[PDB]
Amino acid sequence: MDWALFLTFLAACGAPATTGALLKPDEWYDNLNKPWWNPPRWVFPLAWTSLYFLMSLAAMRVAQLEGSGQALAFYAAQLAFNTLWTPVFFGMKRMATALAVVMVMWLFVAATMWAFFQLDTWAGVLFVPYLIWATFATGLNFEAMRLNWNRPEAR
Amino acid sequence: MNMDWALFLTFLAACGAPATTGALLKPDEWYDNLNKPWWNPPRWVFPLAWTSLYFLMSLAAMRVAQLEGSGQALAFYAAQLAFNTLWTPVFFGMKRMATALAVVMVMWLFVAATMWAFFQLDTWAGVLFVPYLIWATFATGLNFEAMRLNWNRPEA
Amino acid sequence: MNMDWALFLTFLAACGAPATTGALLKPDEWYDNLNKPWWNPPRWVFPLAWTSLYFLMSLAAMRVAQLEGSGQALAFYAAQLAFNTLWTPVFFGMKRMATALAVVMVMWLFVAATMWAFFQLDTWAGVLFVPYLIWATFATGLNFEAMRLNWNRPEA
Amino acid sequence: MDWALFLTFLAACGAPATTGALLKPDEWYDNLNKPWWNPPRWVFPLAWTSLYFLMSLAAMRVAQLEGSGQALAFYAAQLAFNTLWTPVFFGMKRMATALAVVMVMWLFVAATMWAFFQLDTWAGVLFVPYLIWATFATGLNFEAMRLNWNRPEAR
Numbered sequence: 071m072d073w074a075l076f077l078t079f080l081a082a083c084g085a086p087a088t089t090g091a092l093l094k095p096d097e098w099y100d101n102l103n104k105p106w107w108n109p110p111r112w113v114f115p116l117a118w119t120s121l122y123f124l125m126s127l128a129a130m131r132v133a134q135l136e137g138s139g140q141a142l143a144f145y146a147a148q149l150a151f152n153t154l155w156t157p158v159f160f161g162m163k164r165m166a167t168a169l170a171v172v173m174v175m176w177l178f179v180a181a182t183m184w185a186f187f188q189l190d191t192w193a194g195v196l197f198v199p200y201l202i203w204a205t206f207a208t209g210l211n212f213e214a215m216r217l218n219w220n221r222p223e224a225r
Numbered sequence: 226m227n228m229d230w231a232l233f234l235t236f237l238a239a240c241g242a243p244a245t246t247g248a249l250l251k252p253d254e255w256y257d258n259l260n261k262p263w264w265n266p267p268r269w270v271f272p273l274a275w276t277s278l279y280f281l282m283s284l285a286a287m288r289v290a291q292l293e294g295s296g297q298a299l300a301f302y303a304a305q306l307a308f309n310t311l312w313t314p315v316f317f318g319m320k321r322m323a324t325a326l327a328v329v330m331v332m333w334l335f336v337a338a339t340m341w342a343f344f345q346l347d348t349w350a351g352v353l354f355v356p357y358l359i360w361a362t363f364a365t366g367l368n369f370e371a372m373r374l375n376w377n378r379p380e381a
Numbered sequence: 382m383n384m385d386w387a388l389f390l391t392f393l394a395a396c397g398a399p400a401t402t403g404a405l406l407k408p409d410e411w412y413d414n415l416n417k418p419w420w421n422p423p424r425w426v427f428p429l430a431w432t433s434l435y436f437l438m439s440l441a442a443m444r445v446a447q448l449e450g451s452g453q454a455l456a457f458y459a460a461q462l463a464f465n466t467l468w469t470p471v472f473f474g475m476k477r478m479a480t481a482l483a484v485v486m487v488m489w490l491f492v493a494a495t496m497w498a499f500f501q502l503d504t505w506a507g508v509l510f511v512p513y514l515i516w517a518t519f520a521t522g523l524n525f526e527a528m529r530l531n532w533n534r535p536e537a
Numbered sequence: 538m539d540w541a542l543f544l545t546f547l548a549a550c551g552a553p554a555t556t557g558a559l560l561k562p563d564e565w566y567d568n569l570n571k572p573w574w575n576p577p578r579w580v581f582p583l584a585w586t587s588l589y590f591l592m593s594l595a596a597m598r599v600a601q602l603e604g605s606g607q608a609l610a611f612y613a614a615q616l617a618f619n620t621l622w623t624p625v626f627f628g629m630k631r632m633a634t635a636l637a638v639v640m641v642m643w644l645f646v647a648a649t650m651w652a653f654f655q656l657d658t659w660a661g662v663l664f665v666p667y668l669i670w671a672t673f674a675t676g677l678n679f680e681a682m683r684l685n686w687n688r689p690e691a692r
């Protein structure tokens with residue numbers, strides 16, 4: 071357990087965490103037609119805070135191993151597109167563009183998890199709930215568009 | 226040390242996230258009414274600079290990712306790119322100039338940290354980041370001047 | 382290592398310059414209309430904190446000034462005290478919040494530099510500066526919140 | 538010549554240099570009754586910039602010698618009161634208070650110069666024009682008060 075590595079990766083998640091703190095959910099979001107499986111509002115901040123620590127802990131393990139350059143490249147890509155999604159969806163209200171963002175993020179989270187598994191099982195296991203949540207996030211962006219197609223922001 | 230296209234294209238794909246933040250910007254009536262300093266470049270200069278910096282920053286990361294002990298450097302690199310993606314929505318989207326100044330300063334320190342850690346592992350990877358740190362210092366100054374030369378309403 | 386009163390009284394006399402900046406302040410209608418954060422202390426707390434910090438900072442400098450190789454540390458110390466004297470006229474006098482934030486950040490880095498250089502020469506001199514760095518971090522945050530929670534007119 | 542030392546001391550003079558840049562001379566200042574020996578406006582920014590480099594160069598020499606703690610203490614005191622004067626005189630228009638500030642500064646500049654002479658002649662020589670300028674500055678504050686006593690700001 072490298073504390074210098076871990077605190078850097080967790081500080082890196084201060085950028086996506088900042089997007090949530092400055093763009094909390096708004097009536098626009100609560101006026102949208104949600105699917106039947108939409109969870110209560112408290113689920114989302116708890117999930118992201120859990121993932122920030124898990125992904126940071128996983129990256130710290132990988133960053134100590136030889137040949138981890140590709141994995142950390144995948145890790146930098148997923149986190150960037152992670153930071154990108156919330157301002158595109160909540161801030162700009164561009165749902166169709168946000169769907170492309172979250173889908174690219176999903177591919178990079180899946181890539182990071184696979185690359186983590188090739189070097190360390192536990193780092194891969196820690197990313198498994200991240201890929202599950204990303205599938206959830208992709209589904210919500212798709213449903214937000216498909217059940218609200220009558221708005222210009224959805225297309 | 227090879228030109229690694231799998232590494233290079235991943236870091237370059239990573240720079241698609243901040244590039245989209247710029248691409249989704251409309252010519253703003255609020256931005257062009259702001260009192261800018263005399264050394265503020267025209268708006269078209271910024272996308273040209275960022276595309277060059279994306280490649281320099283991508284090539285530098287590609288070199289470092291092939292060397293042993295690069296974990297800390299790439300950690301600084303992931304943080305630098307994350308806060309880079311954060312600035313443009315905070316400044317242009319939310320119009321929070323004071324918050325955007327704090328973001329760009331966090332970005333600057335992580336750019337400086339990445340460059341220092343890169344120099345410890347590879348001189349050329351460090352050299353490639355020098356124009357990134359120069360532009361980041363320049364970018365911080367513009368956020369500072371934009372705030373003090375204009376009216377600022379209380380942030381949300 | 383002695384209690385050196387010639388050294389101690391000089392550093393304490395030096396802290397008379399920032400202390401006068403506080404002493405020459407009138408209860409301001411502009412300052413008390415500003416939207417402050419919930420953790421902003423009442424106005425009377427600040428002169429009490431500064432007087433304690435002046436003595437801690439003076440005693441720490443007095444210890445360092447007796448040791449060999451302290452030139453760099455005392456250089457950081459002179460810079461820290463100079464920018465400390467600068468902040469209060471920039472914030473309260475000129476009402477330049479954005480400029481005052483840059484000043485207090487320069488002060489913070491020189492406080493952090495002095496504490497690091499003090500630790501390299503004397504542990505207790507470094508320990509005495511820890512509450513100074515904590516207060517400086519706190520002071521930076523208030524300047525940041527004062528700016529983003531209020532209206533800011535363009536600076537002169 | 539220690540470049541790390543010299544650049545720190547010169548950066549320290551960025552605080553008093555900032556007071557001048559943010560509080561340039563104003564019509565209030567040009568309406569005051571000045572003595573006959575008042576120099577043109579260009580003399581003052583040139584003098585202070587010259588003194589900033591000279592005092593920084595002098596302090597760097599002293600900071601390399603053993604037993605310089607007292608001198609650098611005097612140096613920190615003069616620079617603090619140097620930073621204090623311009624906001625009290627120009628900013629607050631408190632001429633009487635500013636006279637006490639500049640007089641305390643004068644005593645600390647004289648003390649720094651004497652302490653510099655005890656350790657290194659050249660550091661003392663570099664401070665000699667600083668003490669001359671401080672005497673000039675004290676005289677201007679006194680004359681500003683004595684030839685403008687009919688204003689509340691002068692008393």
Ligand SMILES: CCCCCCCC/C=C/CCCCCCCC(=O)OC[C@H](O)CO
Pocket residue numbers: 176180183184187188190191194205208
């Ligand atoms: C929104 C779209 C939804 C699409 C539907 C979901 C698709 C899930 C596929 C995941 C890729 C699985 C990759 C994980 C394979 C890595 C395992 C591996 O080969 O590594 C060796 C072993 O782990 C050494 O420990």
Ligand SMILES: CCCCCCCC/C=C/CCCCCCCC(=O)OC[C@H](O)CO
Pocket residue numbers: 166167169170173174212215216217219
């Ligand atoms: C290599 C990159 C891989 C990732 C790139 C992925 C790009 C996907 C873009 C989708 C834009 C929106 C198109 C899909 C819109 C479906 C929602 C919808 O239109 O709702 C259906 C209907 O309108 C309601 O009845």
Ligand SMILES: CCCCCCCC/C=C/CCCCCCCC(=O)OC[C@H](O)CO
Pocket residue numbers: 344345348351355358359360362363366
């Ligand atoms: C409007 C302002 C526009 C201009 C903005 C001002 C630019 C200031 C930034 C300079 C960064 C240069 C950093 C150079 C330091 C790196 C050198 C180095 O440390 O090399 C290490 C060595 O090679 C192996 O350890």
Ligand SMILES: CCCCCCCC/C=C/CCCCCCCC(=O)OC[C@H](O)CO
Pocket residue numbers: 500501504507511514515516518519522
């Ligand atoms: C509203 C906010 C109020 C609170 C503000 C947040 C406080 C953060 C500052 C911490 C400074 C502590 C610095 C401690 C580091 C010094 C320890 C050290 O380096 O010791 C060296 C060693 O003893 C010999 O080399």
Ligand SMILES: CCCCCCCC/C=C/CCCCCCCC(=O)OC[C@H](O)CO
Pocket residue numbers: 643647650651654655657658661672675
């Ligand atoms: C506004 C008030 C105006 C008042 C009128 C002006 C008074 C000038 C007195 C200066 C003190 C002189 C102190 C300098 C003496 C230091 C010399 C010394 O003893 O050091 C030994 C020698 O220099 C080893 O090199």
Ligand SMILES: CCCCCCCC/C=C/CCCCCCCC(=O)OC[C@H](O)CO
Pocket residue numbers: 633634636637640641679682683684686
């Ligand atoms: C240890 C500390 C040593 C330094 C402490 C020094 C304190 C000096 C204070 C002076 C305040 C003003 C008093 C002098 C005012 C003279 C100007 C004046 O009054 O003008 C004369 C007359 O009014 C016009 O005709």
Ligand SMILES: CCCCCCCC/C=C\CCCCCCCC(=O)OC[C@H](O)CO
Pocket residue numbers: 226227228229274277278281284288356360
């Ligand atoms: C603000 C904008 C300022 C920046 C504008 C820059 C424009 C591009 C200029 C020169 C290209 C230099 C590219 C350098 C390529 C280095 C990559 C490389 O050489 O790859 C190493 C590989 O291992 C082989 O051995």
Ligand SMILES: CCCCCCCC/C=C\CCCCCCCC(=O)OC[C@H](O)CO
Pocket residue numbers: 140174230231232234235238239241242
């Ligand atoms: C915004 C538009 C740009 C973003 C759109 C998404 C772009 C992502 C596509 C490709 C990334 C690079 C893919 C190359 C990774 C393959 C490497 C790999 O999987 O194996 C590693 C090993 O080192 C091999 O030799």
Ligand SMILES: CCCCCCCC/C=C\CCCCCCCC(=O)OC[C@H](O)CO
Pocket residue numbers: 382383384385430433434437440444512516
């Ligand atoms: C924000 C406010 C927080 C700070 C509030 C502090 C209040 C004072 C508390 C304790 C006094 C500690 C004084 C420590 C004295 C150390 C000086 C000393 O011991 O001198 C060394 C000499 O060499 C002998 O050997």
Ligand SMILES: CCCCCCCC/C=C\CCCCCCCC(=O)OC[C@H](O)CO
Pocket residue numbers: 386387388390391394395397398607641
């Ligand atoms: C704002 C109110 C406060 C400011 C008002 C001005 C205060 C300056 C007075 C005394 C400083 C300390 C004087 C003690 C210096 C004597 C030491 C000395 O000259 O000799 C050095 C040697 O180390 C000895 O043993």
